[PDB]
Write a protein that binds this DNA or RNA. Sequence first.
RNA 1: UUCUUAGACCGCACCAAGACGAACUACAGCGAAGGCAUUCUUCAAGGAUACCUUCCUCAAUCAAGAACCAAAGUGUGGGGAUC
Lengths: 104, 82, 102, 135, 186, 50, 217
Amino acid sequence: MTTKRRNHGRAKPPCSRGRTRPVHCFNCGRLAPKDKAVGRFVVRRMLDQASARDVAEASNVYGAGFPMPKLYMKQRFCIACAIHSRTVRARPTDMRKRRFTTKV
Amino acid sequence: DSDLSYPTVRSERMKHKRRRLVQGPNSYFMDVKCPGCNAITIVYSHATSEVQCNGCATKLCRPTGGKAMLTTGCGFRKKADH
Amino acid sequence: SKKRGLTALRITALGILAEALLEEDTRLPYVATATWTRSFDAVSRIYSLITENPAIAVKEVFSGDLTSKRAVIMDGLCGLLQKLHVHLQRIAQFKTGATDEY
Amino acid sequence: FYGSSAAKDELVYGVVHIYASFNDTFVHVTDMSGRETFCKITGGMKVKADRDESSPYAAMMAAQDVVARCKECGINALHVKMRATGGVGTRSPGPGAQAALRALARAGMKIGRIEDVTPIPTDSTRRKGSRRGRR
Amino acid sequence: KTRGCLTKAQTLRASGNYKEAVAALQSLSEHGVQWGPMYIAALDLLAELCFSQEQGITVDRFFPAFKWNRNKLRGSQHLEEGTKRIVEIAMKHLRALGERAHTNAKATGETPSEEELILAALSGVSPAQRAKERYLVPAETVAQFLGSELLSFNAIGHSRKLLPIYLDTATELIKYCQQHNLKRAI
Amino acid sequence: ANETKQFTTVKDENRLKALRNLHAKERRHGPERRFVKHYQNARSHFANKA
Amino acid sequence: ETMSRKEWYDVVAPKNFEVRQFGKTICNKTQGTKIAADYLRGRVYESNLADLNKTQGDDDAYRKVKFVVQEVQGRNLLTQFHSMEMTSDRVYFLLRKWCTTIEAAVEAKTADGYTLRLFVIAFTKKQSNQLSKNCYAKTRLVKWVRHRITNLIRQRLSKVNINEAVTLLTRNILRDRLAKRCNPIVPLRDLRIRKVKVVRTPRFDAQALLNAHGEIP
RNA sequence: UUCUUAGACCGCACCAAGACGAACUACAGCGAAGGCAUUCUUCAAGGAUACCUUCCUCAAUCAAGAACCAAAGUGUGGGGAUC
């Protein structure tokens, strides 16, 4: 029917680029362009708060104020995959048009 | 204020050189003396070549950029536009 | 400079080498010691060539004045030696007599 | 017992490879080279059920019976290397860790220098599945 | 967090390459072992040792070390000891430097030759009695600077139990001056 | 110039500068004025605040 | 079982590294015509840095230093440097978005037969008064860095021998001399040596080996 | 379903083969479009800017005609790791 976004769900304006590379979803292995796919960056604890105490206790290096390793990765979700897992949600047709830069 | 047949200073001096009501140049000439001789050569501000000192040869400029840049130790007066 | 056994331009080649090395430095500014000597040495070797087998001055072109040869021509004359005199004064002029440099 | 002739009551480190996946856990134990082993005990063995191989109970019930050997070999302390399913498989690990580690540490082993060593490709060919994914 | 460094400093001075030891001391400032020392004093000694190679130390870059050392906490009975130790190393080094300078002056100049003699002869108006004093003016400058900073208050003293140090330092400083030459200052 | 220089640091807050101000061998002498001021920079050794 | 036939040994490291032993290992008996002594050689080992070496080691724990066995002697095992490395987790801390990245792979030679590769990495840095959210470099800028990197790591290590070399990398002596040249080409936030690797090795010797361990505990 | 005491799976070291170039990678860049991401060397090109340079309407658009064109397909030979 209409147009629901000015962008067209992309980070590509016209008269700029023809094709941007496809990429492989974190979940089901679907594909979509880099621009369409939703990026996030995780910064994920190796262990729980609970668990970390019960390890650091024994440990000869950890819990001196020396921090225990964390796991870093990036994740690129498909549109269906995203909305499913509730990374992103449907929003009013007044709050649909909003941005938050890259700041978390 | 600011008639378009009689503009100020500000409302000209900014603008690109074809977008004035005059369409003047943007450049000038100069005189230049080398340490190695007594001469005056007459040199172009946006020279866009290496120019050998009149009666000598050593190069008074480098052709570099959109504005050419004098070889070191050579003194330079300017000239009129009129 | 060594060419292949000749010494014709060798003379010209050694000439430009001394003149180029002496000028460049980019600090602090000035030159000292090693870099000052690697122009002096060249000038002495040039003078040796001039003394000896020369005069005679052949292949390419030689003169002496005016057009281009050109440290050769400035060593005519001897503006080249003048540039060594200038630069030595410079070195001295900055460092105050104390340590062994003097 | 078959333990070290070196020292007494002074730490002897082994290396422990904790393989986490969604369909199994492993615990494995080696010296430092990894050319020689001491244990190779897997979550699966401690359960009878395909379903419950990877669930946290299984993991812990391996880890116990690993340290039940390692002590006799004279391994006091450990160094621990945590791994996830594959390079074209998931960077995220299974739920078989936060199980494993929290057993070992309270089994009277020491711990130091936990690491994450897992395959990360510079690039790969194709992930298994299709353009439309599993659906 | 004191060994992984001292060793680094050792590499930068013992092979000669040579501003590196000073860089290492700067890197060394706490965290993480500010008053154990258990060798903080030892690290300090290595830094003090470096006088005079040009540039890069001239040892007017010292001074941060005194401020750092200390360098809390003093919740123990080592505050006095620490203050005494820093002063002692500085004084010992100062004496050594002075001794070297004196020896050099005494040595060459009577005698000459050939280079000293040529300089004197030149124009140059001058003995080597006169010329050799070149050592001394720098030596005086280093001493003067150290005194000028040392006695002002990070050092510190001042307490019932900390101020009685301060007078000793002054005595060491001044008695040393009386030996030699000098003096604009203190 | 600046390599041989270190830091921000003049010769000096406080007494030293006054001592050099004091006299000349040219013009202005010698002793002129006595300061009673002194300055030393000191603060707690942590990183923003204690 | 198997455990009956198991022996024990102790690894040793060069005298570059302060703490000479750092491990204890296992192996079989020399019974059979196998001779287990053979199979102690061509092994490899993994120690952390600041563990193998003192003590400690500042913000150095992430790096991995790895060895081989060149020669068995006694119940000791003697070694030589093989690769130096780093943890994964580390790198991604120092990697950020809205900045450039640079990567270089050197080929270097010692003064011996050893021939090496030093992987590097660096990142641009915003100016302190900058009001722009780009930090991005041109192309010429980039290339210069990687030029003036390769050159230096081939000029210092050319006239420096094997044990003489490793002591630079471990302590991060190189990083100093590198970055302090680099910076006025374009500002750098970090330079690191991401990984180090050995390609071609000189042929076996007894003396050059033993002279690099000195006393053997 | 499938693979294993003929030692699977797992751990370490090394070798082989084919494909691909993560994160950095963006409401960013280049190309007439389709399209194009490791590094170094090399080969010819193109756009913008700067000029008191040269020439003096040589231009715009476009049936016919011609060149180029994602992926899938057809033929001949080669390769064959992944899907």
